Every structure is written in structure tokens, then in C-alpha cells.
């Protein structure tokens, strides 16, 4: 979980909830 | 845990 759960707000969670996520999608 | 429950998937 310390890779996505919490570690996400660590990297680029700024848009990893809007666009930076669909990257993975 | 704390938030992972839904964080590992959501946040």
C-alpha cells in the first residue's frame, strides 16, 4: 500500500485522480 | 490500517 495508497500523494497524485491516473488506465 | 483500505485503490 505504501506504493499507491499513501505513496501516491507522494508522487504526482495532483492529477493522478483526474488525468495522471488514466496514464495507468 | 489507516486509509489504504480505500487508498490503495482510490488515492
Amino acid at each position: 500500500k505504501l506504493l499507491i495508497t499513501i505513496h501516491d500523494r507522494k508522487e504526482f497524485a495532483k492529477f493522478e485522480e483526474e488525468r495522471a491516473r488514466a496514464k495507468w488506465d | 490500517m489507516w486509509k489504504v483500505g480505500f487508498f490503495k485503490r482510490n488515492r
Side-chain angles (χ1 to χ4, degrees):
Chain A
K1 89 292 296 300
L2 227 106
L3 139 74
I4 163 51
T5 280
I6 173 76
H7 165 292
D8 175 33
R9 336 159 24 81
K10 172 204 194 157
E11 42 142 312
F12 279 113
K14 20 259 264 41
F15 8 77
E16 255 232 28
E17 296 242 287
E18 312 235 88
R19 135 215 299 191
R21 214 304 267 248
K23 320 289 196 171
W24 327 143
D25 233 301
Chain B
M1 13 67 42
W2 353 259
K3 60 284 184 157
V4 40
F6 341 95
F7 253 51
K8 70 219 191 126
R9 44 241 288 254
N10 226 42
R11 261 59 67 133

